[PDB]
Amino acid sequence: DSNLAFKNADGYGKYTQGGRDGKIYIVNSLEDNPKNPAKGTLRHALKRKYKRTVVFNISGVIHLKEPIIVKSGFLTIAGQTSPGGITVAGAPVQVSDADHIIIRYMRFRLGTFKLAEDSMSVRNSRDIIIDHCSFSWSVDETASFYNNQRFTLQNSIVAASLNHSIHPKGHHGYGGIWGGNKASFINNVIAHHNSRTPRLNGSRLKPPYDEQFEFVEFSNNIIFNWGSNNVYGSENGRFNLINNIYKPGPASKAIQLVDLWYSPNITKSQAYISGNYFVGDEKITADNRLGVNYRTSKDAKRKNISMDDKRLSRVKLEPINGAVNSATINSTQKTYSTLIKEKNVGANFNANGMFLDNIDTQVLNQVDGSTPINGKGLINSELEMIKSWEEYERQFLGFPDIIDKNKDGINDRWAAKNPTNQHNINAYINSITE
Ligand SMILES: [Ca+2]
């Protein structure tokens, strides 16, 4: 209850500790020096080895010259402390074999620079929760979260991968590879991807736990304007897929809820698939199995799962290991209202209050149909979406400074107004978004 990572944390990573018991680290520069990272920069902060909450007394775009690989856990990245808001560009932040990490109110937008990379990834970790973040403009995949234990991605925008870009192997507009050992993916908007929205990992890619623990819950997400495929994969992995919203856009070719790949080591009750709303297909909506495809063999094509196939479970599945911290599942109607009308998704606060940047705002408005989409809606470059990087950054620079004379990461003016509590960094950070 008070062990929760934060007030509305849910799903299998909801009890992640992050850096709640650590030092405060203030990032006060947008610079990056991969060779000698200076104190006060993101690279230096994330490479520290002690428990830490990283806060931001700076706003705008951090142009990474190289990836940051995060190996040391007990980390909270409190992106909502930034006066106007932080975007990480140029190279990915890659979490690798780490424990207890909370990441909130952060933007990861690779852009078209020198790497054919993801915007962000988390791998081989455990006790991870990512909340209210925005991911976009990748060359490899936008956001990849696989082979982690006790993981939650919630209330995030994963959108607008770069399709025909600079990847060696050709066009490559992919949402991400999602999987884990009890991993929740809930209340997310996944929009404008040629494919992999997400690609469910299954037991693949050198897992550090055995395949009978590969277990994913995917619920209350909105997938919009996928391309040739949407959700697919999950070889020999189980999953619940409940009360998601599927809304074809002008690029969408596959009309399905999932493309289940060949899974010889599971013969019954591999997935539970129910309550999903397919915009513009009343038959899939009324009976979800009409949108479920299965691959008979390693090289078989997509065909409709046969209707009495027991691969599909009658009841919601549960992981076989430990606490079933499954997320609360709401109706598809409430989900649409919350993410698209209330816009309670993505990096939607800074230290000065609510704020959804123009890129995220456009994406949600296009989902809703209140703003038009040019063509298929699958971009090849962020420069179709922004005039220039310098121009995209300006919007984050026009918010009032957060005065922090004593350098404790607490807004001096909030300290003056909360005397009995003025040194409580947790209570200050909660105040920002509550
Ligand atoms: Ca202060």
Residue numbers in the entry: 25 to 458
The authors write:
Pseudoalteromonas fuliginea sp. PS47 is a recently identified marine bacterium that has extensive enzymatic machinery to metabolize polysaccharides, including a locus that targets pectin-like substrates. This locus contains a gene (locus tag EU509_03255) that encodes a pectin-degrading lyase, called PfPL1, that belongs to polysaccharide lyase family 1 (PL1). This enzyme belongs to the largest PL1 subfamily, subfamily 2 (denoted PL1_2), which is one of only two subfamilies with characterized members but no available structures (subfamily 8 is the other).
The 2.2 Å resolution X-ray crystal structure of PfPL1 reveals the compact parallel β-helix fold of the PL1 family. PfPL1 crystallized in space group P212121, with unit-cell parameters a = 48.50, b = 58.13, c = 149.08 Å. Residues 25–458 of the recombinant protein could be modelled and refined with no gaps in the protein backbone. An overlap of this structure with PfPL1 clearly reveals conservation of the catalytic arginine residues, Arg220 and Arg235, in PfPL1.
